[PDB]
Amino acid sequence: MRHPLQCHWALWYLKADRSKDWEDCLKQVAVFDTVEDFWSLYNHIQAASGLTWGSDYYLFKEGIKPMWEDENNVKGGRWLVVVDKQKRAQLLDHYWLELLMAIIGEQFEDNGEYICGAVVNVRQKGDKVSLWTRDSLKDDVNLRIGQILKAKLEIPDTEPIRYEVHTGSMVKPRIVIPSK
């Protein structure tokens, strides 16, 4: 018996392609719903850090396309956490794995229903790791998630994580930890 996950998650992958547009690079790798199956994917895919520039992995509930326009996201936000370009080597893969284990293992308490997914952006300037939420206004639910994200990933108080919505002005973040 494999151990059933509360729900079905989908791994997505996107490699940057200059000529082609965005949505067509968005490739659904597999859909799993047991711990054993998650590992089978994870053990055998390319480590996040190993990835080329402009590439992502998304892990989202099934039937949620990992984009803004999607209905599950249209009214949501995310918990952005930047990885320093130079301390990237020893942090990135921990942060991403620790998150995926946090989400599939349902660690955000009575708040799980608001988790949409998790994204890793491999980039030159900085690598990014975010947790997408369903509704960018439930600041209790968002704050609580962020506290847990900070715990799970052991992000210190000197590297602040921020929640922000999904122009006119530069839009400032809705929540920050530690606060200012």
Binding site: L5, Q6, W39, G105, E106, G112
Partner: peptide
Amino acid sequence: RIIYDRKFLMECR
């Protein structure tokens, strides 16, 4: 609702 911690998940590897 099914809850698995990181300790457990790693024993599944």
